[PDB]
Structures are given as C-alpha cells and as structure tokens.
Amino acid sequence: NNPLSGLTHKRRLSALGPGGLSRERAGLEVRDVHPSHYGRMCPIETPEGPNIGLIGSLSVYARVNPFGFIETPYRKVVDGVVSDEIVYLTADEEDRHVVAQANSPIDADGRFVEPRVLVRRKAGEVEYVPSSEVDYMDVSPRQMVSVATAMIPFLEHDDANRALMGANMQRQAVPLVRSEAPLVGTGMELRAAIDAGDVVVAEESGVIEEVSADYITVMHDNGTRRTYRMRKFARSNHGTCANQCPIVDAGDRVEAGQVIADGPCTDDGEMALGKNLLVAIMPWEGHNYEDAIILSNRLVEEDVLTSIHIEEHEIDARDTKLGAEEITRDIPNISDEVLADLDERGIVRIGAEVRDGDILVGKVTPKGETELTPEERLLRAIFGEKAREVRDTSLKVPHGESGKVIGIRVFSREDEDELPAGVNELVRVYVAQKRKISDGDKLAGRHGNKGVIGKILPVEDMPFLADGTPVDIILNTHGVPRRMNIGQILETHLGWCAHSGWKVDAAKGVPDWAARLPDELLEAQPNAIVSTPVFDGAQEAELQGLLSCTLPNRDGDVLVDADGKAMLFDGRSGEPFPYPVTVGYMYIMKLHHLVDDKIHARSTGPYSMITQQPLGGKAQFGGQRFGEMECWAMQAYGAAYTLQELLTIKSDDTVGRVKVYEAIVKGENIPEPGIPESFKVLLKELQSLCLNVEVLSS
C-alpha cells in the first residue's frame, strides 16, 4: 500500500510456521512483553487481531548476531563518564551489566548531574543506582521502538494501546495523488523513505543532463552517464498506484545517495502518508457522534483526499477436447454499441472507459450444441437465428466497479512466450478508478484516532474562523479523554504553530522556557516543517511559549489565543459560537478500508454442491451468514415464521426457492416452505455410518 507497509513487512518478526507454536497453541506468557525485548523487538508495533503478540517488528537499532540472537548497541560508562565507544550487546550479557538511561542529564563531559540514576538491573527490574556503578547506557531514545511507531509524534503522550493502533494504521494508508509532507513529524521519515527503496537515488554524484516524465539521465564526473527509468502507474500487489515523479531540474548537480525522484507516498524524499487538514475538536450536530468524522466539501473538490485504484483482470484461451477457444470480437448474439469499444483483436481499446456488465475480452469457446429446447428451434425458425455453435465465456468486468483502461498485455505461444501447458493465449487487462473521498471511508490520525466519514458538508456550512477560512475536518471531543491520546492534541497545537510561523522576542535575553530550546528554532517562517523525535520531543512549556508568539497571518490578527483555542462562526445560523474551541493542523490519512470495497448485496446467486447453501464472499456472489447466535435472537423474539423462512426457502429448500421466486415475480403470496436439503444430506450421511435412522409419521 505504501513504502512504510513494505518496510514493515520486511524487518518483521513472526512466531508462526513450521518449527514454532501456532495460534491454536499460543500461551499468554508467550504473548506477553518480556523485559528482554527492550531494544530488540518493539512492544507497541504488533497486529491487533487474534495474533496479538505473536508478530512484532525489529527495534530500529537492532542487529542479528552470527548465531541468530538479536543484539542491540549501547555505550559504555567508565569512571562515571560516558565514552564514545559503542558495543553491541545480546540479552545474555545485559543481565551481567547495569545499563543506564538514554535521556540522562549528561554534563557535556561524561558525568550525570544526579548520583542516583534510573536504570535496568539484571532481572529486568528498574531501580536507582549511584552514578559511579553503572557500566552501560542507551545509544539514543527510540532504541526500544520500531520503525513505524518511531514516526508517531508525541508518542510519549499517547497511551500504549492507542499508540499500537496508530502504528498499525500507519501501514494501511493508501497513496494519494499528492502526498504532502507532514507539518509536524520525526526525523525518521527521511531514512524510512530512503531505505524502503521506493525513491530513486543518485548512485553516483554528477550533473543532470536531461529530465523527462519517464527517465532521468545524469552526467557523471568520470565521463560515463547513467539513465534511471521511472516506473509510472504500476499496480502494486494491493491495487494501488505506484507512480514516481522527478523532483530535480535540468542543470542541478546531485551527490551520491541524494533523492532524484520521489515515489508513491513520498515528498521531496521523506515519507508522507496523508495530508495536513485544518481541524476543530468540537462536537457538531451529532454527525461526528461516536468516532464519526466530518469534512468540508473542498476536500472532495480540490482532490486533497483522492486515490488511484488500478485493477487487473485475467482470461486465458486454452485448448479443450472439442478444439480451441479463441479471443475474437465476433461473439454470438451481442449488440453493437457494446462492441464499439472492442477492436479487431477482440480486446477493449486502451483508454476506452468501461462500466459494470461490459465486455473486456471477447473470448468465445467451442461448445458445439446441447439439448436444443423446442423454444430455441421455434425462435431460430421465426426470426432466422443461425447456428451460433459457439458459447461466449467472455471476460466481463466484475459487478460493482468501472473506470478507464490503462494498458493490456497479451501472451501467446506463437510469439515464443512461455505459457502454462494447455493455454495458447493469455490476456490481462488493467482498469483504473480515480476514487474520490466519500462517506463510509475510514480516516485516521497518527495517534490511533480512527473513524469513518459520517457526512461530507458543503463548504459554506462549516465553522470558519474570523478570517473566513473554513475548517476542513471536525472530530468529536468525547473520544480524546476516554482513550488517553492527548498527544494528538499536542500535535494539533504544534501543527498550528508550524503552519502560522513564530518569532520569540529576544529583546531582553530569551525567556526561561527557551533557555534550553535549541537555536535556529526561535524564529520560523510560515508553513515551516518541524520534527519531534519520539522521546526527546518538544516539552509542553516549549509548546506553550511557541503558541504565545504566533505571528499573524495576513493582516494583524491572532486567531488562536494563548491557550491554543480560537473563536469560530457557525456557518449555518451565523451566530458566533459561545465558547472558543481548539483549532489546528492535524495530519490525517486515508486508510485502505474504502466503502466501495466493502459494500455487498445479494438476491439470488450461486449455491454450493454438497449442500445447497449459498456461497460466501465478494469473489462469489456472497450471501450473509445467519449464525447460531442470530437463531437464538430470533427465538428470543418469539418470531418463528421469519426463522422458518430464513432457514428453508432462502438457503436449502430448492423447490421452495424456485417457487418463492416465481410467486414473488408473479404477485402471489409466498408458498409454504418444505424440507431443507441439508437435513436430507445429514440423514443420508448418518445412514452411511451404519445407523438405522428414519422418520416416523404416526
């Protein structure tokens, strides 16, 4: 779905498969977090479902010993002074040492300011120790964290399970058409995008000779020149676009390792899985009730949240006992307008838009003839219908999607192409849909605050600041304090500060809060980008001081006051909202749970063979599962006839099914249900086990 998902599928530690315990075998002690995990395997990033705890991710600094044991780096302290020497330590020797803390008050010389420091002892315990006794120290913060989780701002302000949810949803965000870099982030996005391999990098330093939309040629120093071909609109394994775009000029020089062309979910070479949205955190008219989300219509209009979804369809012409199926535009008993998009080859033209029920490949099979019913003979007699000896098992687009056609690949044996034995022609057809954002789609922050889209609202009917800028997205305020993810609000405040810019007035020195704040951060231009490393982050006092000085936008106006709130105008009644509500910029991503891929309905479709139950799943035509719990609920209501109908004439009684369809089409009342076929199957099954089971009528 994105370079994050790829990089997290790699560098992942499973606990299933041959030679290991299985989900049927997992123990709670196995699923627990062992204290030896620190710096080896992340305790936050893990799947949420039944396999919770059996799959994790390598810590960002982890390494594998030659014998398959996970080891992590750590600095050493001698004489109570931390050296620059780094040694890699396995969990075996860690118990024989006393490892100090990453964010300890170092004195720029090697010594800690307090004699007693908080450390981990042999048995996984945490305690205070005189400084002159420790022997190891953490290389950095975020040593204990994975690669995905390390991209969550204000992680330390988030609860463990909500941070787990956020890290698990970081890897399901679809790639949009723009992928704007987040206003607030961590420094991990650059390295993640570089190491995910989805961004072209200059392998040799040199000037750039010429650039187009598909290739980039670089003139190296030593006479030779190199060409990087750039993949465009290639479908990934999960049906998302993998477009790549150049970010370089025609004359600029590049160094080895520099980004040349950004990928699907990247901006200027750093990972960008969503968009910055102006957010208010007040409840609105009940449309954001119970984790629902509201958005302005300008997100639909400006294509802020839109995605390209490419789908491939396959059909093969294969030899058979009666001859060979042929892919040809000549297909019996078909109209002409539906054949307009078909070329002479028999395959839809590239660029011809298609919709549900249309033919992509006209593939016709040799059937000969079957039992010709009297009516077919009468019809060919009355009108003049011909032999039409062949059958049409043509490729039709599956029910429920449309869109344009990108390209076609055609394989045949006459062109030397290797094919499976028995198949002489293979055809794959690629179809794209530019899916816009709609209600039912799932949005999420980086802090586990997910929700579906309750309603898309017209841009006029949205709360707008005094400047007149409407808010873009509205989230409910009851979801924050119950789930303990205040870090998202911290991110909101810092995002507003980074969007507006700031200047700390150093008229008489720097203020007290900015004494330890780094230089070059006292003054930031509008629309700046800031990085908050997960545990050496931005303190609350620093954020408050930044919010204090938040230089005005266009004219002299501080829309957001000292405490981060602002005054909004109700776009429906016009009267100002009685109390200020917090507004800011939050990074919102669209997850791969689009309603278009989750909507199903069935009236009558296929049935299974052994028992006449309907099929299941969107691949077949489906049919919902009425389980034992639903049967219990139906009996609890005392409702019997609907239970009879849900079990008999909708799932097993074949004569009942046909008769009920005839009755409903003709307009008469539903007939009496019969005997389910599954019960007869059970009866014969028990009979085949040498059991004399029968039914007695009196």
Partner: peptide, 21 residues
C-alpha cells in the same frame, strides 16, 4: 542531516546521538 538532498527539518531534540540509524 548526513543526506545530501535532505530538506531542512528543525528539531526539538536536546541531546546528540553518537551513532546514526
């Protein structure tokens, strides 16, 4: 930054790590 084409990203980090990722 140690990456030639890195966009500037001001940071709130107080401490300097010894070794890179």
């Amino acid at each position: 930054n140690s990456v030639p084409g890195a966009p500037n990203r001001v940071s709130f980090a107080k401490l300097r790590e010894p070794l890179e990722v």
